[PDB]
Design a protein around this ligand. Structure first.
Ligand code: BR
Ligand code: BR
Ligand code: BR
Ligand code: BR
Ligand code: BR
Ligand code: BR
Ligand code: BR
Ligand code: BR
Ligand code: BR
Length: 98
């Protein structure tokens, strides 16, 4: 369907993948906003057009236990690379948990 885990902590996904679906796959919550798909998030974050080859890195939400014995935990980052664009929107994205 929408998401394929291609190697550990890496995925190929469709451009219209629902964000809840992406979150379930990667095991982390993403920032919420005025959008509901992975591409919507990307457009919101870049605030620009998205082109094949563009790489966008988005910080993932901490869980409460990430702060247990650590006042300054290190953010996990999701790297997203736009692999295919059609009609000015991404249709395939590479995701890597860094
Ligand atoms: Br798509
Ligand atoms: Br959207
Ligand atoms: Br960006
Ligand atoms: Br632009
Ligand atoms: Br393009
Ligand atoms: Br927790
Ligand atoms: Br393309
Ligand atoms: Br295009
Ligand atoms: Br990748």
């Amino acid at each position: 369907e929408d998401i394929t885990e291609t190697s550990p902590d890496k995925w190929l996904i469709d451009g219209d993948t629902p964000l809840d679906e992406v979150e379930r796959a990667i095991g982390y919550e993403l920032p919420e906003g005025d959008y509901e798909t992975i591409s919507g998030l990307l457009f919101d974050h870049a605030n620009a057009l998205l082109k094949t080859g563009d790489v966008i890195e988005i910080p993932l939400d901490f869980e409460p236990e990430d702060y247990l014995n650590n006042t300054s935990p290190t953010q996990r980052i999701l790297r997203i690379t736009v692999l295919e664009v059609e009609r000015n929107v991404p249709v395939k994205l590479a995701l890597a948990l860094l």
